[PDB]
Design a protein that fits this description.
By secondary structure, the protein is an all-alpha fold. 45% of the residues lie in helices and 0% in strands. It contains four helices and no strands. The radius of gyration is 12 Å and the shape is globular. Bound molecules: heme C (HEC). Its main location: plastid.
Length: 98
């Protein structure tokens, strides 16, 4: 559900990945070229990074561990992270339409 994925992305991701970008770390946007260069232009890789995190990208998964590498907010359920990974892949493929 793209409507549902957009809503969840808007509240859990968009402040950092504004319209597909990255306000913290240049080179690590959600655009296809950056995802590709970073080895993560697949739903499975997007899911894994969202779940466990990397660098200053917090992990959101329920079993993300250790505590310090994960969001200090609530964790996301597996189904939510799957929706988000699908949504990011779809948007990146589409070129992040505005
Ligand atoms: C909400 C759940 C999300 C989702 C789906 C993603 N993020 Fe982030 N992200 C942030 C930073 C600093 C990075 C770079 C980390 C590094 O260089 O080691 C990332 C990276 C990603 C990717 C990979 C992008 C790439 O081109 O390699 C993906 C798929 C991704 N994120 C998804 C920063 C943040 C945040 C700032 C506090 C927040 C919030 C999020 N990300 C949230 C999400």
């Amino acid at each position: 559900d793209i409507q549902r994925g957009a809503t969840l992305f808007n509240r859990a991701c968009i402040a950092c990945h504004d319209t597909g970008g990255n306000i913290i770390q240049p080179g690590a946007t959600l655009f296809t070229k950056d995802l590709e260069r970073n080895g993560v232009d697949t739903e499975e890789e997007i899911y894994r990074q969202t779940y466990f995190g990397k660098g200053r990208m917090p992990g959101f998964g329920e079993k993300c561990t250790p505590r310090g590498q994960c969001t200090f907010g609530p964790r996301l359920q597996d189904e939510e992270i799957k929706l988000l990974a699908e949504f990011v892949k779809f948007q990146a493929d589409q070129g992040w339409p505005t």
